[PDB]
DNA sequence: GGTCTTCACACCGGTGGATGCGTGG
DNA sequence: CCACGCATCCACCGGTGTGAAGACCC
């Protein structure tokens, strides 16, 4: 459950608990006595509650409390089980909190995408959570798909192979000189649903929670669209970077600087809307150092990062995503 | 001293100690009970010993132990003074160790540059540490200057005003659209000594240690060259990034990707020899993801394409860094006429 | 206008998991 | 002579030290 409950933790299986005791089975070059299991805590805390689509006390709750509830639940569970012995270095809580932010925001915008698709097909506009109805003409061809890209994806395998051959041969020509184009995969891709996927019912049902089958469904959602996305159908790219610093904001920038290079200067796409989400952009000047330029081609100059967002609540992210979808989907024809 | 000594630590003044007790004077948004004094630690440990130019036991010692000795000295000092109460979070030891790595390597290469300048001017080749004499023709115009760039420098102020006007105009044109070219300053810049400084005796004396006056001298070495180097006279840039990861290594790459953009695509310089130094490149593939491209110039081919990072280095010992710097200077100074 | 306090810059180290590989029927 | 399992890599963030700049009471 969202709030910690002793009975539900007791009823959990040994291999399904938030904290795994690996004192007797150490990792090779680490001293992690107790290991947080981010999948298990995600399925435990956000099992029946998804932020922005749950009771009105969770949608309006500060996002820094929703993203950080699973770590509190894990710490309480570990204290309950291994009392006077539980200890996790903050360098594990940081990684786990970042991954939880990534997955929770991806789930929230996946629910938003499912609601948008349901509206576009013609199944009405669900009003259980009070959200404004978009002022766009419904159309099955305007539907959207939210992909949570994996840890070490290629991000080009999504492209249609008639437009992937040029990118592959560009990389091959670069490889002849012992060079490359390395990049980190953007943490989420919002694309236009392909033509043959607009009758599927899996893109129109909101997930009840982030259970393990739902985690598998969300994580593996990119496989179904592998090789079915046109270069211009990549509507948005999102980098989830919680609490940026003055040197860690240059990884997303590169993540965009290469991205446009492979979509603007070599594929003819109009623009790439790469944007960064963060929770605590303090101790940094990210609001003014994210106005960086790009490869500029030769006119063709623009911001590398479209915007930086700091979601106040969990519902504000959903509202902003709905507004952005309403603003952009009008460009496509359906 | 290098090895911890109780008497010398006791003789230190309260404001000159490695660890500062700021429990009663907390920082604004932090809970740092004890603050490591990076400058005081550097002046205490490396106060009379510079790695690579000291006794043969320190030159050959593993670099991961030389870079990490001051933190051990501070921990021992704090345990000695605030017993049963000293504790500093590893997120402070990491920052301190990185800064110590940067400053110590900068001092080592500064000593190498001083020896090279002494050889070029005509004072022979000092042979107290056994280093190979470069096989290059001595000339006062081949002298090199090592600058330890500050935390929030610009690195464009170093260029001559004639060659800075084009960069400033490009930045102003970008600024007209609400844009910019932000970048992190490379941690060190090796440049060719300006002709008007080629007789100063300051760039030819090896520092005996990293004392506070010598720390100030090394840190403020860039001020004297503010607007006196040529676009083609920036010999090399060095990013000291200790123990890279699979996501932090993209910060130096950008630091180079912008750099060439302002030296090759807007100044006509032949090439920029940006390179990265690290101690523990484990848990990553930095040896392969540092073959990245650049602004790529023309469409394709071998016209204006090259590695953004020239090479990744992992110094085994403290003397190996000096040997590599000497070899690089000898190999690449024949390009400059003299 | 001179101490004093505050904020941004660049620092790294300890991790969880998906995935390609090591060895044995 | 293909497997079940262990090993390596990818991307995560949070706690800091110091220098330059704002405060401000003159
Ligand atoms: Mg991220
Ligand atoms: Mg560095």
XYZ file of C-alpha atoms (C1' of nucleotides) and ligand atoms in Angstrom:
725
model
C 0.000 0.000 0.000
C 0.963 3.674 -0.228
C 1.123 4.211 3.528
C 3.180 1.595 5.347
C 1.116 -1.281 6.747
C 2.560 -3.972 9.007
C 0.101 -6.708 8.019
C 0.694 -6.356 4.275
C 4.470 -6.391 4.757
C 4.155 -9.509 6.919
C 2.005 -11.177 4.246
C 4.639 -10.487 1.571
C 6.760 -13.377 0.349
C 10.446 -13.550 1.233
C 11.533 -12.956 -2.377
C 8.950 -10.165 -2.825
C 10.102 -7.890 0.001
C 11.454 -4.381 -0.494
C 14.856 -5.026 1.125
C 16.935 -8.093 0.264
C 19.491 -9.366 2.782
C 22.625 -10.241 0.807
C 25.116 -10.238 3.675
C 25.828 -13.929 3.027
C 25.844 -13.536 -0.791
C 27.912 -10.407 -1.465
C 28.204 -8.767 -4.866
C 31.639 -9.094 -6.467
C 33.258 -5.686 -5.896
C 30.764 -4.096 -3.494
C 29.919 -4.153 0.210
C 26.140 -3.717 -0.083
C 24.907 -5.528 3.018
C 21.218 -4.798 2.346
C 19.984 -4.212 -1.204
C 16.968 -2.074 -2.023
C 14.835 -3.802 -4.666
C 13.376 -0.927 -6.668
C 10.935 -3.167 -8.557
C 9.591 -4.655 -5.320
C 9.132 -1.299 -3.580
C 7.555 0.161 -6.713
C 5.081 -2.731 -6.753
C 4.531 -2.407 -2.988
C 4.014 1.342 -2.526
C 2.508 2.159 -5.937
C 0.671 -1.152 -6.152
C -2.893 0.140 -6.208
C -2.204 3.902 -6.388
C -0.782 5.819 -9.352
C -0.022 9.509 -8.692
C -2.197 11.967 -10.568
C -4.937 9.348 -11.035
C -5.669 8.384 -7.415
C -7.496 9.921 -4.446
C -7.366 13.713 -4.362
C -4.944 13.678 -1.425
C -2.225 12.030 -3.522
C -2.641 14.112 -6.684
C -2.278 17.341 -4.709
C 0.542 16.037 -2.523
C 3.985 17.566 -3.010
C 5.875 15.507 -5.558
C 9.004 15.293 -3.387
C 6.909 13.270 -0.914
C 5.430 10.910 -3.515
C 8.902 10.351 -5.013
C 10.507 9.268 -1.762
C 7.637 7.378 -0.199
C 8.980 3.990 -1.437
C 12.369 4.679 0.149
C 10.644 5.508 3.441
C 8.650 2.278 3.201
C 11.816 0.281 2.509
C 13.680 1.887 5.413
C 10.780 1.204 7.778
C 10.501 -2.398 6.571
C 14.228 -2.993 6.988
C 14.179 -1.482 10.468
C 11.246 -3.746 11.339
C 12.971 -6.895 10.072
C 16.701 -6.346 10.730
C 16.488 -4.090 13.766
C 19.642 -2.368 15.061
C 21.456 -3.752 11.999
C 19.817 -2.085 8.974
C 21.891 0.512 7.125
C 21.932 1.599 3.475
C 24.407 4.128 2.111
C 22.831 7.294 0.732
C 24.465 6.504 -2.625
C 21.926 3.673 -2.963
C 18.940 5.759 -1.890
C 19.932 8.334 -4.512
C 19.972 5.787 -7.351
C 16.734 4.187 -6.180
C 14.977 7.552 -5.841
C 16.067 8.550 -9.336
C 14.804 5.305 -10.847
C 11.530 5.584 -8.917
C 11.075 9.139 -10.200
C 11.676 7.886 -13.742
C 9.222 4.995 -13.534
C 6.494 6.853 -11.623
C 6.531 9.808 -14.022
C 6.511 7.389 -16.959
C 3.465 5.642 -15.479
C 1.678 8.955 -14.892
C 2.196 10.075 -18.472
C 1.271 6.590 -19.728
C -2.067 6.936 -17.939
C -2.410 10.384 -19.512
C -1.674 8.889 -22.941
C -4.241 6.134 -22.382
C -6.890 8.709 -21.472
C -5.950 10.798 -24.520
C -6.242 7.770 -26.817
C -9.598 6.837 -25.284
C -10.821 10.367 -25.997
C -9.451 10.303 -29.552
C -11.109 7.003 -30.494
C -14.491 8.249 -29.291
C -14.981 6.547 -25.927
C -15.625 9.848 -24.150
C -13.528 11.640 -21.553
C -13.262 9.950 -18.164
C -14.080 12.441 -15.413
C -13.285 10.507 -12.226
C -10.237 12.763 -11.733
C -11.201 16.356 -12.435
C -9.161 17.207 -15.542
C -10.006 19.668 -18.297
C -11.272 18.145 -21.530
C -8.876 18.930 -24.408
C -10.292 21.189 -27.121
C -9.154 19.030 -30.046
C -11.244 17.213 -32.627
C -11.214 13.465 -31.855
C -9.437 11.296 -34.418
C -7.985 7.756 -34.289
C -4.863 8.970 -36.126
C -3.957 11.557 -33.456
C -3.364 8.952 -30.740
C -0.101 8.965 -28.800
C 2.215 6.347 -27.301
C 4.513 6.792 -24.295
C 7.614 4.580 -24.286
C 9.854 4.138 -21.243
C 13.149 3.448 -22.988
C 15.399 0.826 -21.330
C 18.777 1.358 -19.690
C 21.020 0.753 -22.727
C 18.711 1.094 -25.723
C 19.740 2.274 -29.185
C 16.707 4.573 -29.667
C 17.160 4.320 -33.444
C 15.674 0.831 -33.621
C 12.342 2.615 -33.122
C 12.759 4.272 -36.525
C 11.131 2.818 -39.638
C 13.818 0.766 -41.452
C 13.367 2.754 -44.670
C 14.630 5.757 -42.664
C 16.943 3.767 -40.368
C 19.254 2.664 -43.191
C 20.591 6.205 -43.656
C 21.414 6.515 -39.946
C 22.998 3.052 -39.888
C 25.163 3.825 -42.924
C 26.160 7.165 -41.375
C 27.337 5.313 -38.267
C 29.080 2.723 -40.453
C 30.932 5.439 -42.359
C 31.969 6.981 -39.052
C 33.149 3.567 -37.811
C 35.566 3.251 -40.747
C 37.778 5.869 -39.051
C 37.502 4.307 -35.591
C 34.955 6.875 -34.371
C 31.400 6.730 -33.073
C 28.333 8.610 -31.874
C 27.753 7.485 -28.278
C 24.810 8.832 -26.315
C 22.606 8.019 -23.347
C 19.057 7.046 -24.237
C 16.480 9.721 -23.343
C 14.484 8.501 -20.372
C 11.147 8.642 -22.214
C 9.860 9.007 -25.776
C 6.384 10.279 -26.673
C 5.606 9.251 -30.259
C 2.608 9.190 -32.584
C 0.900 5.803 -32.648
C 1.491 3.934 -35.939
C -1.413 3.311 -38.289
C -1.773 -0.419 -37.598
C -1.719 0.044 -33.800
C -4.711 2.411 -33.662
C -7.224 -0.423 -33.147
C -5.417 -2.094 -30.233
C -7.083 -1.907 -26.822
C -3.811 -1.992 -24.858
C -3.153 1.726 -25.480
C -6.571 2.780 -24.152
C -6.847 1.243 -20.657
C -5.427 3.074 -17.655
C -3.297 0.850 -15.432
C -4.749 0.401 -11.951
C -1.261 0.562 -10.443
C 2.414 -0.207 -10.888
C 2.146 -3.912 -10.179
C 4.792 -6.279 -11.513
C 2.804 -7.253 -14.655
C 2.128 -3.553 -15.216
C 5.828 -2.785 -14.755
C 6.596 -5.397 -17.420
C 3.938 -3.909 -19.706
C 5.278 -0.361 -19.324
C 8.965 -1.287 -19.587
C 8.476 -3.474 -22.661
C 6.146 -1.044 -24.413
C 8.951 0.036 -26.768
C 9.362 -3.454 -28.258
C 5.965 -3.343 -29.970
C 6.878 -0.096 -31.767
C 10.417 -1.184 -32.714
C 10.819 -0.247 -36.365
C 7.380 1.358 -36.722
C 7.977 5.037 -35.828
C 8.491 7.606 -38.567
C 11.219 10.245 -38.097
C 8.593 12.977 -37.765
C 6.361 10.976 -35.415
C 8.763 11.342 -32.470
C 6.685 14.050 -30.826
C 8.646 14.533 -27.606
C 11.691 13.329 -25.696
C 11.895 13.578 -21.912
C 14.953 13.302 -19.665
C 14.005 12.699 -16.030
C 16.879 14.123 -13.966
C 15.928 14.670 -10.330
C 17.810 17.460 -8.527
C 20.262 18.581 -11.187
C 23.677 19.963 -10.260
C 25.995 22.343 -12.084
C 27.859 19.498 -13.832
C 25.197 16.780 -14.193
C 23.073 18.987 -16.456
C 25.555 18.448 -19.305
C 24.575 14.815 -19.817
C 20.979 15.621 -20.887
C 22.297 18.422 -23.110
C 24.545 15.964 -24.931
C 21.591 13.556 -24.954
C 19.799 16.225 -26.984
C 22.766 17.576 -28.952
C 23.367 14.210 -30.605
C 19.620 13.563 -30.858
C 18.829 16.529 -33.101
C 21.968 15.740 -35.101
C 20.387 12.402 -36.027
C 16.857 13.761 -36.522
C 17.268 17.327 -37.796
C 20.500 17.332 -39.801
C 20.192 13.821 -41.256
C 16.468 12.966 -41.419
C 14.616 16.210 -42.178
C 12.346 16.161 -39.133
C 10.948 19.617 -38.279
C 12.158 19.786 -34.669
C 12.893 17.644 -31.621
C 11.156 18.654 -28.388
C 13.688 17.431 -25.842
C 12.766 18.558 -22.330
C 14.125 17.896 -18.841
C 12.109 17.199 -15.695
C 13.529 17.825 -12.233
C 12.286 18.072 -8.665
C 14.866 20.212 -6.814
C 16.872 22.386 -9.250
C 18.503 24.232 -6.351
C 22.175 25.016 -5.961
C 22.388 25.435 -9.732
C 21.609 27.845 -12.562
C 19.911 25.262 -14.782
C 17.179 27.729 -15.761
C 19.675 29.812 -17.771
C 22.341 27.275 -18.823
C 19.677 25.178 -20.575
C 19.351 27.801 -23.334
C 22.223 26.161 -25.216
C 22.514 26.098 -29.001
C 22.881 23.019 -31.219
C 24.853 21.826 -34.255
C 23.326 24.858 -36.065
C 23.902 23.130 -39.411
C 25.603 25.704 -41.636
C 18.698 30.048 -39.499
C 18.548 26.501 -38.113
C 19.488 27.523 -34.548
C 17.264 26.738 -31.563
C 17.425 25.691 -27.929
C 18.904 22.239 -27.397
C 16.510 21.682 -24.472
C 12.962 22.887 -25.094
C 12.140 23.528 -21.433
C 12.913 22.559 -17.852
C 9.954 21.490 -15.727
C 9.608 21.215 -11.950
C 6.282 19.499 -11.162
C 4.805 21.045 -8.004
C 2.244 18.267 -7.533
C 1.578 14.935 -9.219
C -1.504 16.297 -11.011
C 0.387 19.292 -12.423
C 2.512 16.945 -14.536
C -0.638 15.348 -15.963
C -2.190 18.753 -16.661
C 0.963 19.973 -18.414
C 1.155 16.799 -20.502
C -2.487 17.176 -21.539
C -1.909 20.822 -22.474
C 1.194 19.943 -24.502
C -0.614 17.121 -26.308
C -3.526 19.426 -27.126
C -1.093 22.062 -28.411
C 0.970 19.714 -30.583
C -1.406 17.014 -31.889
C -3.242 19.721 -33.849
C -0.251 19.779 -36.217
C -0.835 16.191 -37.351
C -3.757 15.423 -39.661
C -6.498 12.955 -38.779
C 54.555 16.263 6.268
C 53.677 13.479 3.829
C 53.394 10.778 6.478
C 51.291 11.801 9.459
C 53.290 13.310 12.326
C 51.806 14.182 15.710
C 54.279 16.956 16.547
C 53.843 18.872 13.286
C 50.054 18.591 13.514
C 50.156 19.877 17.096
C 52.372 22.795 16.046
C 49.762 23.847 13.469
C 47.598 26.857 14.245
C 43.852 26.464 14.721
C 43.035 28.166 11.408
C 45.735 26.157 9.581
C 44.450 22.687 10.497
C 43.157 20.061 8.085
C 39.705 19.697 9.682
C 37.586 22.670 10.756
C 34.970 22.220 13.484
C 31.891 24.111 12.286
C 29.327 22.420 14.521
C 28.618 25.762 16.211
C 28.631 27.683 12.888
C 26.554 25.596 10.464
C 26.400 26.340 6.753
C 23.047 27.527 5.404
C 21.457 24.403 3.898
C 23.948 21.729 4.998
C 24.611 19.623 8.089
C 28.402 19.397 7.699
C 29.609 18.999 11.275
C 33.306 18.828 10.325
C 34.610 20.516 7.175
C 37.665 19.208 5.354
C 39.992 22.119 4.559
C 41.181 21.240 1.058
C 43.784 24.013 0.864
C 45.095 23.355 4.378
C 45.273 19.609 3.712
C 47.191 20.200 0.482
C 49.587 22.567 2.254
C 50.032 20.051 5.094
C 50.574 16.773 3.228
C 52.270 18.104 0.078
C 53.950 20.945 1.949
C 57.477 19.898 1.041
C 56.971 16.944 -1.344
C 55.664 17.216 -4.909
C 54.958 13.814 -6.511
C 57.206 12.907 -9.413
C 59.941 15.279 -8.195
C 60.575 13.899 -4.694
C 62.337 10.880 -3.180
C 62.228 7.771 -5.351
C 59.725 6.113 -3.011
C 57.040 8.690 -3.825
C 57.596 8.929 -7.586
C 57.169 5.172 -7.995
C 54.323 4.847 -5.496
C 50.875 3.999 -6.873
C 49.051 7.212 -7.717
C 45.857 6.080 -5.974
C 47.805 6.238 -2.695
C 49.417 9.629 -3.340
C 45.986 11.010 -4.296
C 44.277 9.964 -1.086
C 47.057 10.540 1.408
C 45.708 13.988 2.456
C 42.277 12.503 3.180
C 43.899 9.860 5.390
C 45.887 12.579 7.158
C 42.720 14.604 7.760
C 40.834 11.571 9.060
C 43.671 10.748 11.458
C 43.889 14.379 12.600
C 40.144 14.588 13.198
C 40.149 11.321 15.126
C 43.047 12.658 17.204
C 41.334 15.959 18.025
C 37.598 15.156 18.031
C 37.767 11.549 19.160
C 34.660 9.335 19.140
C 32.983 12.272 17.388
C 34.736 12.799 14.037
C 32.696 11.772 11.000
C 32.713 13.230 7.484
C 30.360 11.930 4.818
C 31.881 10.120 1.849
C 30.290 12.739 -0.423
C 32.811 15.209 1.032
C 35.773 12.845 0.741
C 34.887 12.354 -2.930
C 34.894 16.087 -3.704
C 38.080 16.650 -1.711
C 39.863 13.739 -3.401
C 38.887 14.987 -6.849
C 40.113 18.501 -6.102
C 43.358 17.121 -4.649
C 43.876 15.001 -7.763
C 43.373 18.060 -9.962
C 45.692 20.337 -7.987
C 48.445 17.751 -7.442
C 48.519 16.738 -11.111
C 48.547 20.414 -12.090
C 51.520 20.998 -9.779
C 53.371 17.981 -11.192
C 52.909 19.186 -14.756
C 53.830 22.726 -13.665
C 57.146 21.384 -12.377
C 57.576 19.543 -15.681
C 56.874 22.779 -17.570
C 59.367 24.673 -15.407
C 62.064 22.092 -16.148
C 61.224 22.214 -19.865
C 61.458 26.018 -19.894
C 64.771 25.858 -18.028
C 66.085 23.469 -20.679
C 64.850 25.694 -23.515
C 66.297 28.936 -22.131
C 69.712 27.336 -21.648
C 70.130 26.203 -18.030
C 70.680 22.594 -19.073
C 68.645 19.601 -17.928
C 68.302 19.155 -14.173
C 69.074 15.523 -13.361
C 68.183 15.178 -9.672
C 65.282 12.892 -10.668
C 66.245 10.525 -13.456
C 64.198 11.756 -16.429
C 65.130 11.417 -20.089
C 66.532 14.547 -21.706
C 64.269 15.615 -24.601
C 65.775 15.252 -28.075
C 64.627 18.685 -29.257
C 66.591 21.750 -30.306
C 66.545 24.304 -27.453
C 64.838 27.611 -28.232
C 63.310 30.314 -25.989
C 60.221 30.403 -28.232
C 59.363 26.751 -27.469
C 58.676 27.334 -23.765
C 55.369 26.107 -22.349
C 53.060 27.498 -19.662
C 50.690 25.405 -17.538
C 47.556 27.186 -16.306
C 45.247 25.745 -13.647
C 41.964 27.318 -14.703
C 39.679 28.449 -11.843
C 36.251 27.124 -10.910
C 34.095 29.412 -13.089
C 36.513 30.789 -15.672
C 35.630 31.663 -19.267
C 38.787 30.395 -21.059
C 38.029 32.915 -23.799
C 39.672 35.794 -21.907
C 42.994 34.016 -22.479
C 42.776 34.674 -26.225
C 44.236 37.864 -27.700
C 41.696 40.697 -28.155
C 42.030 40.482 -31.945
C 41.005 36.807 -31.868
C 38.517 37.350 -29.023
C 36.377 39.782 -31.032
C 35.075 37.062 -33.365
C 34.163 34.781 -30.443
C 32.450 37.661 -28.641
C 30.542 38.581 -31.808
C 29.381 34.980 -32.241
C 28.261 34.834 -28.604
C 26.421 38.152 -28.960
C 24.697 36.945 -32.122
C 23.583 33.818 -30.287
C 22.447 35.959 -27.335
C 20.156 37.998 -29.609
C 17.783 34.999 -29.761
C 17.929 34.261 -26.033
C 20.587 31.557 -26.424
C 24.152 30.898 -25.310
C 27.146 28.572 -25.319
C 27.562 27.336 -21.738
C 30.456 25.023 -20.951
C 32.595 23.869 -18.052
C 36.160 25.141 -18.007
C 38.742 22.429 -18.760
C 40.644 21.742 -15.568
C 44.027 22.654 -17.072
C 45.409 24.418 -20.143
C 48.942 23.998 -21.496
C 49.768 26.890 -23.835
C 52.812 28.326 -25.585
C 54.464 31.068 -23.547
C 53.804 34.549 -24.997
C 56.869 36.174 -26.516
C 56.821 39.015 -23.974
C 57.001 36.511 -21.084
C 59.821 34.437 -22.617
C 62.421 36.087 -20.354
C 60.654 35.917 -16.976
C 62.417 33.779 -14.373
C 59.096 32.849 -12.735
C 58.253 30.198 -15.358
C 61.616 28.463 -14.824
C 61.789 27.743 -11.068
C 60.433 24.447 -9.767
C 58.285 24.824 -6.657
C 59.609 22.893 -3.667
C 56.100 22.017 -2.483
C 52.426 22.908 -2.529
C 52.588 25.470 0.248
C 49.906 28.145 0.502
C 52.021 30.788 -1.319
C 52.759 28.191 -3.999
C 49.075 27.247 -4.171
C 48.273 30.919 -4.767
C 51.045 31.132 -7.374
C 49.765 28.104 -9.298
C 46.093 29.082 -9.035
C 46.699 32.647 -10.209
C 49.007 31.721 -13.077
C 46.217 32.282 -15.620
C 45.752 35.951 -14.676
C 49.097 37.018 -16.144
C 48.178 35.392 -19.483
C 44.686 36.933 -19.660
C 44.589 38.048 -23.283
C 48.062 37.057 -24.445
C 47.754 33.581 -26.023
C 46.962 32.973 -29.673
C 44.143 30.692 -30.869
C 46.738 28.283 -32.254
C 49.014 28.615 -29.220
C 46.703 26.684 -26.862
C 48.822 23.538 -26.991
C 46.509 21.196 -25.081
C 43.612 21.049 -22.631
C 43.360 18.513 -19.811
C 40.265 17.394 -17.902
C 41.184 15.707 -14.614
C 38.174 13.462 -13.973
C 39.005 10.805 -11.389
C 37.182 7.457 -11.608
C 34.740 8.123 -14.429
C 31.320 6.490 -14.624
C 29.112 5.675 -17.596
C 27.213 8.984 -17.356
C 29.755 11.472 -15.978
C 32.143 10.914 -18.899
C 29.724 12.888 -21.091
C 30.629 16.068 -19.216
C 34.249 16.258 -20.486
C 33.057 15.328 -23.985
C 30.805 18.382 -24.084
C 33.687 20.380 -22.592
C 35.614 19.393 -25.719
C 32.737 19.461 -28.216
C 32.141 23.140 -27.486
C 35.874 23.860 -27.245
C 36.732 22.837 -30.806
C 33.551 24.591 -31.947
C 35.139 27.832 -30.720
C 38.693 27.068 -31.872
C 38.270 25.179 -35.158
C 34.942 26.351 -36.579
C 35.358 30.000 -35.561
C 39.130 30.579 -35.315
C 40.824 28.336 -37.891
C 43.156 26.647 -35.412
C 44.568 23.339 -36.712
C 43.440 21.061 -33.872
C 42.768 20.967 -30.134
C 44.465 18.246 -28.092
C 41.851 17.860 -25.381
C 42.548 14.839 -23.190
C 41.175 13.278 -20.010
C 43.077 11.889 -17.026
C 41.591 9.360 -14.620
C 42.735 6.990 -11.892
C 40.121 4.193 -11.776
C 38.268 3.852 -15.110
C 36.563 0.666 -13.922
C 32.876 -0.113 -14.137
C 32.727 1.729 -17.460
C 33.685 1.549 -21.128
C 35.322 4.978 -21.318
C 38.100 3.579 -23.525
C 35.545 3.100 -26.325
C 32.926 5.845 -25.800
C 35.689 8.478 -25.937
C 36.090 7.924 -29.692
C 33.257 10.401 -30.248
C 32.991 12.802 -33.177
C 32.672 16.604 -33.209
C 30.766 19.357 -35.058
C 31.739 17.189 -38.078
C 32.295 20.144 -40.442
C 31.584 19.029 -44.006
C 29.140 16.284 -45.013
C 31.363 13.225 -44.537
C 34.860 11.887 -45.122
C 38.197 12.724 -43.509
C 37.898 16.496 -43.941
C 36.979 17.862 -40.499
C 36.269 14.773 -38.378
C 38.402 13.681 -35.423
C 38.098 12.363 -31.887
C 36.666 14.870 -29.425
C 38.960 13.474 -26.708
C 42.464 12.766 -27.987
C 43.301 10.130 -25.374
C 42.331 8.839 -21.942
C 45.229 8.462 -19.513
C 45.516 6.402 -16.329
C 48.788 7.325 -14.579
C 50.228 4.209 -12.919
C 52.736 6.169 -10.830
C 53.400 9.852 -10.213
C 56.541 9.770 -12.375
C 54.700 8.235 -15.338
C 52.586 11.385 -15.655
C 55.754 13.496 -15.808
C 57.316 11.148 -18.365
C 54.198 11.265 -20.548
C 54.080 15.063 -20.351
C 57.752 15.311 -21.332
C 57.242 12.916 -24.248
C 54.173 14.826 -25.449
C 55.978 18.171 -25.246
C 59.019 16.810 -27.090
C 56.879 15.229 -29.812
C 54.549 18.183 -30.390
C 56.828 21.200 -29.877
C 58.631 20.648 -33.192
C 55.509 22.052 -34.870
C 56.206 25.466 -33.324
C 59.106 27.193 -35.061
C 61.981 28.434 -32.922
C 33.187 50.515 0.944
C 34.808 46.812 3.944
C 34.019 42.910 6.264
C 30.413 39.346 6.255
C 27.331 36.022 4.634
C 25.333 33.532 0.489
C 25.076 31.149 -3.690
C 26.662 28.674 -7.836
C 30.571 25.683 -9.904
C 32.621 21.407 -10.538
C 33.721 16.887 -7.510
C 33.103 11.920 -7.072
C 31.499 7.312 -5.025
C 28.228 3.634 -3.785
C 24.207 1.070 -6.526
C 20.008 -1.929 -8.952
C 19.054 -4.326 -13.027
C 18.976 -5.974 -17.970
C 22.046 -8.548 -20.720
C 25.862 -10.613 -23.012
C 29.163 -14.220 -21.672
C 31.627 -18.628 -18.756
C 31.655 -23.139 -18.090
C 29.408 -28.285 -17.843
C 25.997 -31.703 -19.211
C 28.021 -27.935 -26.510
C 22.881 -24.631 -25.018
C 22.185 -23.602 -21.229
C 21.122 -21.551 -15.953
C 24.262 -17.778 -13.114
C 27.345 -15.134 -12.225
C 29.907 -10.955 -14.028
C 30.377 -6.423 -16.212
C 28.346 -2.063 -17.828
C 24.611 1.669 -17.906
C 22.600 5.608 -15.870
C 21.219 7.439 -10.815
C 21.816 11.167 -7.515
C 23.336 13.639 -3.015
C 26.566 15.863 0.254
C 30.549 19.405 -0.363
C 34.748 23.328 -0.317
C 35.781 27.667 -2.053
C 35.734 31.913 -4.799
C 33.071 35.724 -6.543
C 29.187 38.566 -5.636
C 25.234 40.693 -3.036
C 24.174 43.110 1.897
C 24.182 46.831 4.277
C 25.018 49.701 7.581
C 27.050 52.995 7.127
Mg 17.612 10.902 -16.176
Mg 37.651 17.177 -13.641
